Amino acid sequence: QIWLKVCAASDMQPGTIRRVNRVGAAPLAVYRVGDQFYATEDTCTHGIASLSEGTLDGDVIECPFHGGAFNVCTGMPASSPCTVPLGVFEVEVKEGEVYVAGEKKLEHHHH
Amino acid sequence: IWLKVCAASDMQPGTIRRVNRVGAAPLAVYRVGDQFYATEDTCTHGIASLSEGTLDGDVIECPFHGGAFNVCTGMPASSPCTVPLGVFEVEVKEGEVYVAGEK
Amino acid sequence: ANVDEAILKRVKGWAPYVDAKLGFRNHWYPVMFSKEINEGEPKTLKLLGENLLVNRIDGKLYCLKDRCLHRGVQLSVKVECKTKSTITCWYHAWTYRWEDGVLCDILTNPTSAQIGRQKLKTYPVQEAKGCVFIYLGDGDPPPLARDTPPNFLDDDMEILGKNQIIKSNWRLAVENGFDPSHIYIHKDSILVKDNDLALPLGFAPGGDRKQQTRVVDDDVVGRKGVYDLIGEHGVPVFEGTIGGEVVREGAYGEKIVANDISIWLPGVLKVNPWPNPDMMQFEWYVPIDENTHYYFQTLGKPCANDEERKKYEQEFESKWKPMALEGFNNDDIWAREAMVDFYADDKGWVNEILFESDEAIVAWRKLASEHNQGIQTQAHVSGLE
Amino acid sequence: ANVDEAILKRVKGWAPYVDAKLGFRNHWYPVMFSKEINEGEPKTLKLLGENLLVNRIDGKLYCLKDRCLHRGVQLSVKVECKTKSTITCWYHAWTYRWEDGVLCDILTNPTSAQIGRQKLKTYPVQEAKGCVFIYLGDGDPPPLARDTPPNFLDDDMEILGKNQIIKSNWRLAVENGFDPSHIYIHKDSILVKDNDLALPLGFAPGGDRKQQTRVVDDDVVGRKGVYDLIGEHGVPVFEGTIGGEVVREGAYGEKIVANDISIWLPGVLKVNPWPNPDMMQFEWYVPIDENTHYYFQTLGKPCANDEERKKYEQEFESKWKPMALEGFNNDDIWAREAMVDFYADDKGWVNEILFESDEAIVAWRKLASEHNQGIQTQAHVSGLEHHH
Amino acid sequence: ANVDEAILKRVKGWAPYVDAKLGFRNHWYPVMFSKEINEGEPKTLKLLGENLLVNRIDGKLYCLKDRCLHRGVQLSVKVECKTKSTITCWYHAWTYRWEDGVLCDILTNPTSAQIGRQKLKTYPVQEAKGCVFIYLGDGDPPPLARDTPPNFLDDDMEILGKNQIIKSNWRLAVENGFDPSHIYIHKDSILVKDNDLALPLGFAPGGDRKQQTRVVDDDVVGRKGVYDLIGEHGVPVFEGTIGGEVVREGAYGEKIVANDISIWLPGVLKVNPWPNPDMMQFEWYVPIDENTHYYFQTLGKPCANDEERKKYEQEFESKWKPMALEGFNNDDIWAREAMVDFYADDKGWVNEILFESDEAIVAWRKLASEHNQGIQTQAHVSG
């Protein structure tokens, strides 16, 4: 519920993406950038494409439908036509296991 | 059945020579290196004289619309040409060039 | 290359489809009805940007490109068929054979070296269900069935239709007819009530992506299409709400139609059943050039005799054609044209903001991009460099 | 750059102006009269190349871009305002709020993940002096006063006008109007004789390249423009001569008008006094697209009470509008059209040969180049591009 | 250039010609008939893409470019000739002299420093045989004779004609006219039947390529042209056959005409004799812009006195004009238009498939490319 087990950290090679299906909720995308892990909604905010089916270059994921792109850490648009920021989900590694938050980061109680 | 074109000494590498025949369509003799080839002189795409074209290696370029043909196979090498060029028997008998009928 | 490379590089999922603004080459296309072309009366038509000539000789149809090889004039400017098997250009009398396009004679100079050495382009033509199909392609054509939707070629299937020219690229026509949510535009249809049909405003998808459509690539007849299954796991919307308030409702009726819709290459939609539980609609979107297409719409219905036709034939002209094909589909025509500006500069292919029901359309684009038999270009039309 | 760099390189003194083919973004532009848009009746219009929709809800005006975010069709093809505060696209029913353009509902799929997460472009709209002004720009708008000529907004200034679409780029209209020598085309105007005006064939330069021309860029409301002080520093030419011989004369009426003309960003001319000693003419040349503009004419007259306002309205309809706005300015319309061909491929800006009377226009081109708030481009129209 | 460089590179035999989409600069061209322009009544026209104004002052013709040096408007929008020797722009009153185009006054600013320092482009104009010729070129002009077919300017040659704007590039018009095999389109001509003329369907060429035409690189007056000699050693075809069976025949009239056909730069055809034994036809295909031309038709006949000329004038209006210039040549007009699409994208100059009779056309293209006096470009049009 609060944290969703994704897979073993070792299961993902750096620079790859993994889609996380959720019953009752929209799918998420977990990205492994080097040794770090980030997560955002899987659905591009510009349409209905699956970001996990796109190209990950650095910490920027490129959508496969129209070439838009986002920064996987901040969820902000990096290339047009994307304009709406992606919801970001916290990720934590414990016991070498990857966990992704069940609720997106809230514009609540922050910097 | 052959006819005298000229002494191989007459043609320099990469040049062309027109061969007029009595009561017959004209031919073009090309000299690629030391090899000699012959084809119809009239371009298959129109009415141009290929012997007035430009020889680039083994490919002859028509001076009218830029069409081209491989002088060895007589096959088209560049549009708008699409119809194969008739190739004729060529041979050398002691410093003398000679061409015959269509092979 | 019919589109800016920078754009094709952005749509990595269906570039070939975006590039095919002139249509797909090497496919069959209905262009007119058999009753429209009599014996010895050549008709002209433009298909995939190419001006063509169709003639009926001894009951058989033939297709020659409508452009003389000499100075490139249209032979149709002044038709001169001096023998049953040939056509003579009105300019310098270059003469071609309808069966192989060969230049067999030149009245202005019968000693010309061109005679028998040049050949004018020809295209296969096949009649079927009272429809004329031209294989706009090169090499040996495939069975006409490969480019027809299922059930169109049924012996008992009485195929009747209508045809006209519409001012929109062909793709916009396709993506309008196969758009599950476009039914909203028909919400005020008089035919729906005058046939007490049931038609929702839209649909609330259900299940995953895959379940939304059925991609066909295993049909043995060769076909390539996609079925729209949004209605299986999805709940139809019959009540439209704005801010929790209902402002619009769908149409109620016992007649459950269109519970099966599929799009097939090169560009033909199948809506079964429609406009009645017993009938069916087949409509092609034939590319004439980059801005227009033939809206080739037909209505299939099984039969078994004269009486099973004359009554239908009477129905068609009486209600169907006027109600389903014109009265109903006319809403599709102007909706089709309304999308022209957004896609005219090819920018729409990158800026469109799609939503759930567009999953079908996306499947279609991927299918078309993967199983099209070739992209028609200006090189095929004018001077193949 | 909407213009070939090779041409811009040849007009370095005022390149931005020559590049501003579609007009200047981030400015207020009048597009219609208040009386033309009624409650609940959406009107369409194109401004700076963008198709827009304006509606009046509870007396207030709202402006939405007339292009659905879905498939890019124009909503106006079949307006469907189901609720007072919204508009529903006729194609797939995406519904937007006029207030902020937010996509709030979708009749065809009430469960769509797009609802609440997309916004249609909107633009600030304001009514002043019976005119409808739209801020074709981004972010919080500046005060309307910045983009209006002096006195137009005065409380006692009664404003009446006419608007129409003319087939010429907006700049050709600006330069036709702010031209002191162009009045030669108006020498046979009915208004001249019928209103007993004193009007030379042209106002020629007199002082120097600094006294007759006055550049204004230190105004408190922030307006930027140029004055051509023809009346107090110019030379009136009443006798036109060819080879020393008089072939034409100006008008020797008693009424003194056109003491000074001024052009202001984004593109509004002020003629004072005109067409009568106690009036002023304010006219906008609003960019619709690269080939057309709105010729938004207005005539201002200070009125001290209702009786005077009522009298002015009657004379506007019976005299001023037909005799001045139409009878005088109608010649400006075909004149503007006559310049189209020369400037069509932007070469005109390099090939024109100007003379002394054109010094004011040059000052305007430089001012416009320096103080405009943004060059509108085709990218703004179809959608701004950007890669990382 | 006016044409894609990729195409011009392909047509090495006649690149200048293919590039000459707007026509050849520095040549004389007929644009109207003398009686079409009266004293003090300026007429507008477009030639080689340029808008021009022609006026008759004291019986003499003058030609100014119809474009003000100030804001580039056409002066003709509202013609204002305030003195016999000048024209004043309707906009800001810049005033020009018809004789040399010099800016002599500016009504709206009499002291402008521009006065006397600017000049509007002028072109020479000459009238001959009742036709108005304009020299669309720069510097001193050559004799008109250089740009006219032989005999056109003969003292006793009486010239009558008709002019109209046709929708096709000037070159397609020229080629159609000099095309030996195009006579096939005239096989059902009313003129041929009623004037009992001999007209074959075409020609089976004979002899070598060089014998097919006769290039004239220099008449004493500098003329450049090409005579069509296909009939010198060729065999006229009177029976058209398909698969060996007759399907059409030519016209066996007893009257032999058009045994002398030539084309001359800048683009005028001479058919002699035509349409009758004692007459000649001279026709120009004058470039207006890239898609249209003036089809300036004239019929000549030697007349030794006011009687013959009156008699000729009569036959012309009642027979020759309607039966020949219109009845016969109308077919040429739609023929020309039919070639527009193929050549519009410039692709036709590469893909055309020529046959034997086209040798005449090839010779004209090479002559035109080698001896034209200049290629008119868009730069000449805009500045």
Ligand SMILES: c1ccc2c(c1)Cc1ccccc1-2
């Ligand atoms: C001098 C210069 C310009 C103008 C006038 C006089 C009147 C007038 C009315 C409307 C627009 C411009 C002008």
Ligand SMILES: c1ccc2c(c1)Cc1ccccc1-2
């Ligand atoms: C035979 C061949 C060519 C022509 C004529 C006869 C008349 C005529 C008039 C105008 C152009 C060509 C020709």
Ligand code: FES
């Ligand atoms: S769906 Fe991702 S860029 Fe458009």
Ligand code: FES
């Ligand atoms: S005649 Fe040789 S390429 Fe055309």
Ligand code: FES
């Ligand atoms: S154009 Fe058809 S035969 Fe010459």
Ligand code: FES
């Ligand atoms: S185009 Fe407006 S909802 Fe689809």
Ligand code: FES
């Ligand atoms: S445009 Fe002719 S005088 Fe100004």
Ligand SMILES: [Fe+2]
């Ligand atoms: Fe529909």
Ligand SMILES: [Fe+2]
């Ligand atoms: Fe004016």
Ligand SMILES: [Fe+2]
């Ligand atoms: Fe002819």
